[PDB]
Every structure is written in C-alpha cells, then in structure tokens.
Design a protein around this ligand. Structure first.
Ligand SMILES: O=P(O)(O)CP(=O)(O)O[C@H]1[C@H](OP(=O)(O)O)[C@@H](OP(=O)(O)O)[C@@H](OP(=O)(O)O)[C@@H](OP(=O)(O)O)[C@@H]1OP(=O)(O)O
Ligand SMILES: O=P(O)(O)CP(=O)(O)O[C@H]1[C@H](OP(=O)(O)O)[C@@H](OP(=O)(O)O)[C@@H](OP(=O)(O)O)[C@@H](OP(=O)(O)O)[C@@H]1OP(=O)(O)O
Ligand SMILES: O=P(O)(O)CP(=O)(O)O[C@H]1[C@H](OP(=O)(O)O)[C@@H](OP(=O)(O)O)[C@@H](OP(=O)(O)O)[C@@H](OP(=O)(O)O)[C@@H]1OP(=O)(O)O
Ligand SMILES: O=P(O)(O)CP(=O)(O)O[C@H]1[C@H](OP(=O)(O)O)[C@@H](OP(=O)(O)O)[C@@H](OP(=O)(O)O)[C@@H](OP(=O)(O)O)[C@@H]1OP(=O)(O)O
Ligand SMILES: O=P(O)(O)CP(=O)(O)O[C@H]1[C@H](OP(=O)(O)O)[C@@H](OP(=O)(O)O)[C@@H](OP(=O)(O)O)[C@@H](OP(=O)(O)O)[C@@H]1OP(=O)(O)O
Ligand SMILES: O=P(O)(O)CP(=O)(O)O[C@H]1[C@H](OP(=O)(O)O)[C@@H](OP(=O)(O)O)[C@@H](OP(=O)(O)O)[C@@H](OP(=O)(O)O)[C@@H]1OP(=O)(O)O
Lengths: 351, 361, 362, 361
C-alpha cells in the first residue's frame, strides 16, 4: 500500500511507502519516497522535500486570549527537481509511475522524541500540545527565493508518525520489583510488588504479583492495582498529568498475622478509556490507528526538555487498612515499567 | 420622504408594497415584514390572496432545503383587517379601500442573507440563503382542485441583514512565539484589535508587537483580513479569501522589538474579483456587501445556518535565512473578530413609490 | 420549667431577675438582656433605681490595674418610666409571678463588642491576667440635703453575665493546605496535604483532620503529630502573645521512602483535655464548671481589632518527624497550619424555678 | 564596633554576631564568626549547636485561598559550641575580644558559606502579578538539645535563638578596566535606515551610582523620531517550584526632543535605579523585606561556571531599554532595544551591643 497526496495546482505529487516510521532506539527508519512533477507546471522552478519535527502548545477558544508556541526540534531539506544510493521502493515506484518521478531520502537523527500529543479534559489546567512530524514537498521560482515566498498551491504536506519500537538486541529482562515495610505501632505491614519484566508492548497483558505480609493487628480491607500514565510537558509550560489507563480491585482482605500473594493481569489500552482527553496519545483522538503514547526514551547526553512531552508508565498498588475502632488509612506505592511497540522484524487516516 | 417598494403581478390583480428591501436582525429580535397588498376587486372576485415568507438554502442551479415557511391571508379580509403599523395605516389611507395589510415575522433560528458564486480555481458550486416574500391569488373553477396561476402572483427577494447587538465580546488579543531549528532564542508576535465587533466600512486598527530576540531579521510584516466560509448543508465546501491586506514598510532587526498599528478596511470594493467570497446579495447588485459574521444562537444546530461566515486578522512575518535552511513553513498568527452592520437606532410621512428591483453596476 | 437567676442587694431594697446568665451573639445580631428589678417600696421611697450594662477590658487582676470600657448603657426602672409595660413574654410573666413592685428593663448589645474572653497566665508565661467582662448592675441613688447624690453599695447588685459566640447562617470555604520540602542534597520532595471537613466547628464537636503525606524522599516520616493550637493576642495595654496546644493526636503509622499515606485523625479541642487550665483563653473563670475554651474572635468589617481587647483564633498544625533530617540537614521542624473557627452551634406562660446567679464550681 | 545580640526565651543561649550582612565578592564569601553565651546552670548536661541554613521559599497566607507552601534547602551546616571541642578550628580578633568582654561562658563558632549559593533576594507581588511571595533566606540558629531530646527528635524552641542574616553581592576585588556596554541597531523603514546606538560608561554599576546612557539616533528616513524614552528595567525569573517572570521599570527619563528626517542627535541621560524612586515596592526583587529601612533593590545574580541556574532560586538581571516613538503620515510606530548591565555593591577593602532586629520606615 502506497500513500499519495497532490498539490492544489497539481504540479507536485508526493508518494510515501508508509505513514508510520519506526524508531527502535539503535537507529530510526528513514523516509524514502518519490515526487511526481508535471514538467509543464514546474518549468524553470526547483522542487524540494523537507522533514520538520516541531513541538506545539495552544488551542483556539472563543473569548480566551490566543496563546500559541512552536519550537522546531529538527529541520532537514533535499532537492528532488531538477535531479542532482536508491532503495527498492523508489526504483519500483519510478518504473510504475513514469520518467517525471524523482526520489528523495530524508533521515531522522537520534535526539528526537516520538509522536506524542495531548488534548486536555475540562478539569485539566494547561492546553493542547504535541510533537508533529511533517514531510512537505514544494516548488520555488528564482524570484520566489528573492522575496522569500514558497507558493502554497505548489506545495503538499504529510503528517507522518515516528513510532517507538523496542530495540532488536537486549539481554534477558530483569523483573521490575520493589518492596515497602509500613510499620504501624512498631509491627510491620510488608508489601512487595513484582512484574514479569521491565518492558511491555501495547496490548500485552501485565501480570502484577502483589505480596502483602500483615504482621500488624490491623486488616488490609482492599487491594487496588492501577496502570498510571504520567505526562510531563517540559517546553513552554510545566504541565503535569497522571491518569489511570487500567485498574483491577481484588477486594480480598488480609487479616492480622497473615500473608497473601495474588497476581492481577492488567492491559493498558486507549480502548479501556471512554474519556480519551488528559492522556498522551501517538495520534489524534478521532483517528482509529491512534494508541497510548509509548514511554519516552531519553538518550544519554540529551537534555530531556528537547523531547517536549515526557511520557512514563507505572503500576500503582493502593492498600486500604482498617482503623483501631474510627475511619481507615490508605498506603500506596509505584513500580515503574516502559510501554512501547514490539521489536522490529529483520494519506488520510481512518476515523 | 419614506421610499416605498412596489411590485405588480403580470395580470395586475395583485400589487405588493414593502417599507424596505432589507429587514434588520439585531440578535435580540428580528424586524418583521409589514406591508400591504393592493387587489383589483374585479380580478380577485371569488379568489383568495395570500402572502408567504420563505427562507431556503440552495446549492447548484440541484439541492434545496427550506429553513422557514410562513403564510397569511390578506383577501378576503381576516378579522378586524386593521393595520398593526403606522406604515400600514398610512399606506392604506394613501392607496385606497382595496389595500389590505399583512405582517410576516422572522424567528430567531435563521441565518442572514449569505450567498457565494465560486471562481474558476474553486472546487464546489454556487450556493446561498434566499428570503422570498410572495403574494399570490388562488381560485377554483373545478370542485376537484384549487389553482395558483403564476400571472396572479408577485415575488420579492428581500434581505435579512445582520446589525450589532447591545453588547460585545472581550477585546481580541493573540500571542505567538517561535524557536527555529538550532536557535535557543525566540521570535515573539503579539496582535491586538481595539474591539471584538467592527462595522462594514469601519477601519480596523491592528496593533502588531514583534519582539525579535533571534539573530535573523523580520524582512516583512503583512496583515490580512481573511474571510472564512464553510458550507454546512449538502456539500462541506471551505473557502478562505483575503478581503483586505496592508504591508508594513518596517523591518525588525536582530535583538530589537517593534510595535506598529496598521489600519485595514475589509470592503467588497477592494475586490475586482467578487467570486469565491460570501456576499449578502448578488454580484451584479450595487447595494451588495461582504456577508456579515454568522451568529449561531445557543441550542441551534449550526447546519440549519446553511453557510457559516467568519472573519479573522492574519499577521504573517517573513524571516531572513529561515526559508532556505530552517523551515518550509510560514510564520503567522490569526485573531478572530466579527463584522456586521451598526446597532439600530431605537404626522403622516410623504410616500415616494419605487420598483423593488435593485440597481446594478 | 424556665430557670430564673435572682440576686438581692445587701440592704434588700433592690432584687434583680434575669432569664439567663449567657446571652447569644450570632454575628447578625446579639440577644438583648431582658429582666426585672423587684424593689421594696419602703426602702426605695424617694430613691431612683437604674440598671447598667458595662463591657470592659481589664489587665492585672481578675483593685489597681489597667481598664478600658468598650460599652456602657444605663436605663431607669424606678420610678416607672412611661408605660412601664414589659417588652418580652419573660418580663410580662415575671411581673405577674412576682407582684406590682416588679419593673422591667431591656439593655441591648451593639455589634462592635467582643465575646466573653479571659486569660490567667502559667508560671512560664510572660504577661499578666486579663479579660473582657460583661456586668449587669442594678443600683439605687438618693439625694442629700447638701446638693450631692449618693450611690450606696448596699443598695446595688451586680451580675457577671457572658456574651457567648454562636455560629452565623453561612460558613467559609472548606479548609485545605499543601506544603512540600526538598531537604539539603535531596532532589525529591516530601509533600504534605491537610484537609478539614468544614471551616466552622462547635465546642465538643470532633474535627476530622485528613492528612496526605507523599514521601518521594529516601528518608522515613517516623511520626505524624496533629495539634489544635489556640493563638491568643492581647491587643490592649500590652502586646501579649500565647500559642497553646488544646488537643493532640499522634498517628501510629510511619511513612517509608517512595510511599504515600492518607490518614484521618479526629481531634476534639476541650478544656477538659487540659489539667493545666492556665495560659489558654477561656469564656469564664477557671473554677466555674460551665467555663469552656474561648470561641474564635469575629472582627466585623470597619471595626478596629484593638477594641476586641483579646484576639482568639484556632488552627490545625501537622508536624512530620523525618529520619536523618533533624541535626544533619535542618535545625527547623517540618510542619503546616490550617486555620478554622470554633464557636457554639447556630441558634434556633412558663413555670418559673428561681436560683442564685452564682455559677457552680469544680 | 556595633555587635548584634539575641537571647533565647529561657535565657540559656545568647548569640552575638559582628554584622547582619555578610559580603559575597564572587572570589570568596565572608564567613559568619560569632560567639554563644550559655548560662551554665540552664545548660544542665545538654549540648548547644549553631547552624547556617540557606532556603528558597514560595507561597503566602491568604484568607479563603488554599494555603500552598514550598521550601528547598540550598545549604545546611552545623557546628557544636558547648561543650567545647573547638569544632570551628582557629579563632578571630572579634571572637577573642568578645570572649574577654563577656566572660568564660562565651564559646566561639565559625560557619562558612560555599560558592554555589545565591545572595539575599525576595519578592512580594503586586495585585496585577500572577505568582506568589518567594525569596532566599539565610538563618543563623543557636539551639540546645538534651540526650532524651535527640531520642524523641525534639529541639525545644525556648532553648533556641534564630537570626535572619543577609548575603550581600559586592563587586570582586580584581577586574580589568571595564569595557563600555554599547550596541547599535539599523531599523530600515522603506529601505532608508534609522540607526540607534546606545552606550554606557561601563558594564558594572553600584547601588546609588548614576548610569550615564548615551543615545545616538541617526535618522536617514523621511519619518520623525517624536519621543525618546530611556528605562532601567529589572528582570526577575523565579526558577524553582513556579516559572514566574517579572519585568519592572526602576528608573525612567523621557527626552521629548524630536529627531527630524535627514538629521542625527546624540543625548546623554543619567538614570539612578533606586528602591526610593518606587512608591510601589511590590513586584520588584529586593535584598530584604519591604518594611525594613536597609532594604535595597536585589543585586544582579552571578551564576558561577558549572552551577545550574535553578539552585539560585530567583534570577535578577538589569538592562537599559531605549524606546523610540516614530511618526507615521494617522498613527505612529515604536522601536525599542536593550543594553544589559550588572548592579551590585562596591568592591570590598570598643563594643556597643544592639538587638539584631532591623529598623522599619
Ligand atoms: O487575488 P488577490 O489576493 O487580490 C492577488 P493574488 O492572487 O496575486 O495574491 C497573491 C498575493 O498578492 P497580493 O499582495 O496582491 O494579494 C501575494 O502577496 P505578496 O507576495 O506579499 O506580494 C502572495 O500572498 P501571501 O504572501 O500573503 O501568501 C501570494 O501567495 P503565495 O506567496 O504565492 O503563496 C498570493 O497568491 P494566492 O494566495 O492567491 O495563491
Ligand atoms: O491531509 P489529510 O489529513 O490526509 C486530509 P485534509 O486535507 O482534509 O487535512 C486537513 C485536516 O483534516 P482531517 O484532520 O479531517 O484529515 C484538518 O484537520 P482539522 O482542522 O483538525 O479538522 C487540518 O489539519 P490540522 O488538524 O493539522 O489543523 C487541515 O490543515 P489546514 O488548516 O488546512 O492547514 C488539513 O489540511 P492540509 O493542509 O493538511 O491538506
Ligand atoms: O424581481 P426583481 O428583482 O424585483 C426585478 P426582475 O423582474 O428584473 O428580476 C428578475 C431577475 O433579475 P435580477 O437578478 O437582476 O434581480 C432574474 O435574475 P437573472 O437570471 O440573474 O437575470 C430572474 O430571477 P431568478 O434567477 O431569481 O429567477 C427573473 O426571474 P424569472 O426567471 O423571470 O422567473 C427575475 O424576474 P421575475 O420573474 O422575478 O419578475
Ligand atoms: O459563701 P459564699 O461563696 O461567699 C456566697 P454563695 O455561695 O452564695 O455564692 C457566692 C459566689 O460563689 P460561688 O460561685 O462559688 O457559689 C461568688 O462567685 P465568685 O465571685 O465568682 O467567686 C459570688 O457570686 P457572683 O458570681 O454572683 O458574683 C458571690 O457574690 P458577691 O459577688 O460576693 O456578691 C456569691 O455570694 P452571695 O452574694 O450569693 O452570698
Ligand atoms: O506530645 P507530648 O510530649 O505527649 C505533649 P507536648 O507536645 O505538649 O509536650 C511538650 C512538647 O514536647 P514535644 O512537642 O516535642 O512532644 C514541647 O515541645 P518543644 O519544647 O518544642 O520540644 C513543648 O511544646 P510546645 O513547643 O508546643 O510549647 C512543651 O510545652 P511548653 O513549651 O513547656 O509550653 C510540651 O509540654 P506541655 O507544657 O505542653 O505539657
Ligand atoms: O526582628 P524582626 O524579625 O524584624 C521583628 P520580630 O521580632 O517581630 O520578628 C518576628 C517576625 O515579625 P516580622 O515579620 O514583622 O519581622 C515574624 O514574622 P511573621 O510570621 O511574618 O509575622 C516571625 O518571623 P518570620 O518572619 O521568620 O516568620 C517571628 O518568628 P517566630 O515564627 O515567632 O519564631 C519573628 O520573631 P523572632 O523570632 O524574631 O523573635
């Protein structure tokens, strides 16, 4: 399946192999495509293709001051026409389309975030924001460069996604486990939480093993296990969101001088969430192929602020503990894990 | 002298008289259509004369949707038959005893006069919202059926014109900033208008505040009034058109800021090409202006407006060294405002009668 | 049965009768003092009997000491003034019950006065005894032959009434505090959030203090201590300041590293909790049984706070004791305060039992 | 000289300091040398310590607004005075002299400042300002502890005494002859240049020192410079808890002299940025509380190489701003530029005892 889009004036048509380009940490899948020009309508002009990654912040509200912010995180441009290595997709598209088809290759660097965006809920303090990736093909004249204008009718833009996949090689995953001792009157309530591994895939079930050892004279009335998505906007405005994307409540008691081990399975999915606002996604709410944002992966030496939006996941265990008799207390603890797409194997989107 | 607008049927049995061509919508209420029908007693003997107010959306020359229909009987006379307006009482006395009054009211859920004839480059077809006042006679020569001859009827294309409400939105303001690739220092743009509602012909003072902390130069500042049109019945056509443009002669060099007020006047007269833009009448007519801003009432589905018209100030900054190496995009912000006609200002008078037909160019 | 409070002068010429010892201030208005004076016609022949309402701040003694009058009002009971008719059911009923030598009086409170507050300091406290008293005095005056009028003490009778703070119709927003600390060399915060159910609590009503400790540090919250602190500011003569614990609850939970704990402790601020009844603002004398903690002062808009004499306020204080911290990474305490107001509940012939106005001791 | 004394509630611990204000001159910071006078009976087998804390704080107490507070310790250090171990090492003339003056129950302490701390800065906002009260405080606290006091984790308040000292920014002892702080801008208007050059005598000015701002307008345009305004702006950035930004005029001179087309004008305006010029003392960074007499404008923050600016808590900087009002043909433009400079205190070079409390206004 090839994805095509044509300029208003039909002088420039762009063809891409895919909408979604894979980041698997080691390297990023480059954007290889072709531009089909109409020789009469290009005439004495030059056609370029650009790859822009930008962070954006702000939304249009009636009677609320317009506030907009944009920061380019990467820009790269190449000339396709007139022509100045190739790939199988290009060679095949050229033969399929004709002699007015010209190839382009734009590469991603290693310091960029992946597709993340966020539209807030009514109770949420800050505004709409996200990281977009735009492939734009456009024609310029030599009096167009002289006035600094690139006519819109001669241009065509595609909003591609950079998608986080797990790296191809990685050693056998350590279990993600922590333990806490909550002394209550100098008798310990011990809580251990353990996951099977550190990295889970979108759709993969997460087996959360909870081990309560109650040496206190109080009763654990209730055990609740959540997958929480933590979002930190780290450009323009320091917005913070924490949202439940999966929840199981065991509801089984742990009486005094007893211990209880239980494994609950959670699956953090956008489908579990009627309310799709306040949560970091990899695309727009309306689109069908939109998932929960993958865990941000900050490379060594890269300042976290250039990622724009930081997305992390954690298992939260809340224990309701009975009073003396009065009302009851609640302790809670977090175990971090990472959520991304599976390891890789060796244009308008559906609503 | 009060100018009265008259039109007569082909068979000259029914003549309709209106106080005005254009009826004022000022949001709170709409000015009702008060007029009189002059019948020829010999030619309407046995017949019944009615007056109707129709509002319809149209697309092509192909789809029609009625948004409002209302009808009243003028002849034979209904009840008291007495006028409800000074204009009616005065027209009856001026014309004779074969003059009968009618009052047709507008509801609050209707759009105002908007229509659009596309340019060659535009996708999508002709469309608009028309308001028709029709007076017509009906008879039976047959027990099986009543007839409505066209020769016994007379139709007027009136306009529903948007005038300003009592109140007004907060003062429009935008702020935008850009950090270009490999640039740690921002370009800040702030835009302010004096008020939220402007009148057709009124100048719009657009205050632009560029703060250039970058090592690049703002070569050009261009300020537009853009008219955004959304057809929301039959076909989802979208038009965005410049109806006014002013280009400041100032550059903004590195590590400097510039505040400047450009004055724009969005007018149909500025536009040689009158196709692709929403008007309140036909291109040919002289009294035709740019369409007023649509005002959707709370609880009314926007689709029953047929065509949505909105205005915005767009400020575009051309930046040096950017277009080659650091962006393929334009640096711009938009500030919305509303455009309509001024607020309304609230012995027998002499009547000069004129044909309802509007003057061309 | 309506309990009536009677007191008689030494010479038994003037006897005063009151419906109550305690008159209600509910912010909107104050309950006026309606009573009757029973005169002995033989002993008041040629004399004039008056009733006065005095509100005074005092400092030194509970006599040589600083005094400031905040309000004085006086009315004539005998010989009878005008109609002489009762204005209350209590008066009409007392007149019929007692006889034709019974005369009514009504003394009203204005809106700019404080309520009954007084303070007797502890040994460790700087500053002296002080308070706001309300005195109802009925007294007879006669003329001598040289032009000088006399006011014998034997012909007079004084009652120390209380002005008691009851809640208004409305109430402030729900009290909430948030506090966070980053200790020296610690990148991660200790967050404390405190919430009360409501803004106004009643004497005897339990206060549910919800604490939410979020410990992102590698230190342990060893103790959570929740206090009701009474803050007293003397604002006439001498700027004395007292802050005193009138209730304390110590949660038995620790909060270990990288954990959070939500807990609701219930406190009841009462004078009964305090063996030591000195150093704290009361609404009466220590010895008296019906004496409580002073209600929160309520300064009306436009009234200078100094004419209140003693300012009383309450707050919830939450102190977190943190491991490794105190002596190594701070010389301060980790704590937050949430203000609330403490007063009596909103406010809503008869057989009469007569009793001496004197209040019962302990 | 003048010595500053404060005594605990229980009168067991009394602290004596040489000064309220300790000098930071970039190279090093003046250490806090003082003495604690203990009452041997009231010590009663206990241990007395002296601590130096530097903390950033954020939040203010409002009636019917949720209490929100934040504190971050930037430095904590503690030494033992009693019983003596000579923790503070070698002693100083002020200490030796105070010991002989006071008695044998006087014990010396020396607490040093490191080089990664900010100076005394605090800010109480105005009504129009968005964020809350914040500042950097320096506390010297002497306090006694028992061995059942460490067991319960209590340091009784009556046995303790705290002093709020200031860390004051002075210019460093050695620095090369100061370069003039000068920039120039060319504002092309219709492709004719308006050239503005701004020059200061030097880069560092002292509190109270006048700043001679030389402005040089060269107008080759056909427009007129109607007005020249010169400001000292104080820029404040809170960089802990909340990213608050304040920009405030602390001095202003307006030359209302014109520069007509095809002419140039040089003018030297003298400004003196002072807290005394400001009736409204809220919204601006001070080195102390508003009420205190010895409170000035905050000195320029001096971030040392390798120190993350966030550990300074509040960043304070100064700049000269020159605004030129330029004529149109029916409304006018305004260009402006900034020249940064630094503002601090001058380079550094019988006992009367007084309470440490500072004099008000
Ligand atoms: O019908 P109009 O608007 O009155 C006259 P026009 O059609 O020549 O408008 C062009 C406009 O001409 P005009 O200023 O006369 O409207 C020119 O303005 P100029 O390049 O600044 O001179 C550019 O406008 P912008 O700079 O705002 O984009 C052109 O856009 P490009 O930069 O080529 O994309 C416009 O072309 P268009 O938008 O119709 O394709
Ligand atoms: O290109 P696609 O997605 O395959 C199909 P489309 O052409 O209808 O997309 C438009 C998109 O339509 P859609 O999202 O339905 O594809 C609309 O989205 P909407 O305004 O949010 O509804 C806007 O995109 P944004 O969301 O990025 O603003 C339009 O941006 P403009 O404001 O016109 O510049 C897009 O127009 P574009 O310029 O990209 O061709
Ligand atoms: O009616 P008006 O404006 O007061 C004066 P006109 O008679 O010149 O208007 C005619 C109108 O003239 P105009 O547009 O100038 O009002 C023309 O419009 P044209 O096709 O653009 O010439 C047609 O109007 P429509 O297209 O709306 O039907 C004619 O309809 P017909 O096709 O004859 O039925 C109108 O004639 P009508 O039938 O109303 O007497
Ligand atoms: O044997 P006692 O205790 O001296 C007399 P009591 O037991 O009847 O009560 C007295 C009461 O004593 P108590 O309250 O213990 O019964 C005391 O109270 P205190 O002044 O607060 O100590 C005063 O009562 P008030 O509160 O009405 O002033 C006394 O009134 P004076 O002010 O001296 O005139 C009362 O003496 P009373 O006048 O009734 O004979
Ligand atoms: O929690 P606990 O121990 O069971 C009861 P507490 O906290 O009141 O104990 C004392 C408290 O001990 P702690 O609070 O450490 O338990 C101490 O605290 P410290 O002097 O600061 O150590 C002082 O409390 P404050 O500081 O609040 O006044 C003492 O008051 P004084 O200063 O002598 O008036 C308190 O003794 P009190 O005199 O009240 O019986
Ligand atoms: O010499 P100063 O400080 O300029 C005048 P002050 O003696 O009234 O100081 C008090 C200060 O008064 P002020 O603020 O007027 O200096 C008050 O401040 P407030 O809480 O804002 O009233 C508190 O200090 P903070 O400013 O640190 O809070 C008091 O500390 P506590 O919390 O009681 O320990 C201070 O009392 P101190 O400890 O000096 O005896």
């Amino acid at each position: 399946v090839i994805f095509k889009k044509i300029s208003r004036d039909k002088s420039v048509t762009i063809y891409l192999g895919k909408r979604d380009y894979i980041d698997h940490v080691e390297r990023v899948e480059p954007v290889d495509g072709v531009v089909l020009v109409d020789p009469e309508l290009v005439k004495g002009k030059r056609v370029y293709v650009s790859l822009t990654c930008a962070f954006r912040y702000g939304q249009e509200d009636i009677d609320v001051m317009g506030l907009s912010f944009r920061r380019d995180l990467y820009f790269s441009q190449v000339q396709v026409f007139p022509p100045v290595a190739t790939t199988r997709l290009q060679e095949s598209l050229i033969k399929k389309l004709g002699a007015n088809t010209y190839p382009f290759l734009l590469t991603f660097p290693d310091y960029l975030p992946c597709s993340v965006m966020l539209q807030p809920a009514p109770q949420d303090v800050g505004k709409s924001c996200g990281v977009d990736f735009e492939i734009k093909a456009f024609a310029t004249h030599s009096t167009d460069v002289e006035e600094d204008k690139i006519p819109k009718k001669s241009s065509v833009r595609l909003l591609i996604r950079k998608v986080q996949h797990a790296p191809r090689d990685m050693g056998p995953q350590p279990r993600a486990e922590a333990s806490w001792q909550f002394f209550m009157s100098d008798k310990p309530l011990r809580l251990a939480v353990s996951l099977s591994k550190e990295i889970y895939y979108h759709g993969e079930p997460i087996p959360v093993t909870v081990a309560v050892t109650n040496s206190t004279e109080k009763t654990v009335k209730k055990i609740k296990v959540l997958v929480e998505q933590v979002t930190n906007v780290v450009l323009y405005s320091s917005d913070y969101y924490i949202k439940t994307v999966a929840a199981e409540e065991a509801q089984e008691k742990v009486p005094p001088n007893s211990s209880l081990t239980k494994t609950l399975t959670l699956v953090p999915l956008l489908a579990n969430n009627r309310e799709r606002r306040g949560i970091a996604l990899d695309g727009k709410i309306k689109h069908e192929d939109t998932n929960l944002a993958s865990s941000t992966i900050i490379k060594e030496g890269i300042d976290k602020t250039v990622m724009g939006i930081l997305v992390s996941y954690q298992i939260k265990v809340k224990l309701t503990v009975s009073g003396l008799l009065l009302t009851s207390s609640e302790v809670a603890t977090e175990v971090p894990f990472r959520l991304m797409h599976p390891q890789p194997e060796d244009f308008a989107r559906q609503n």
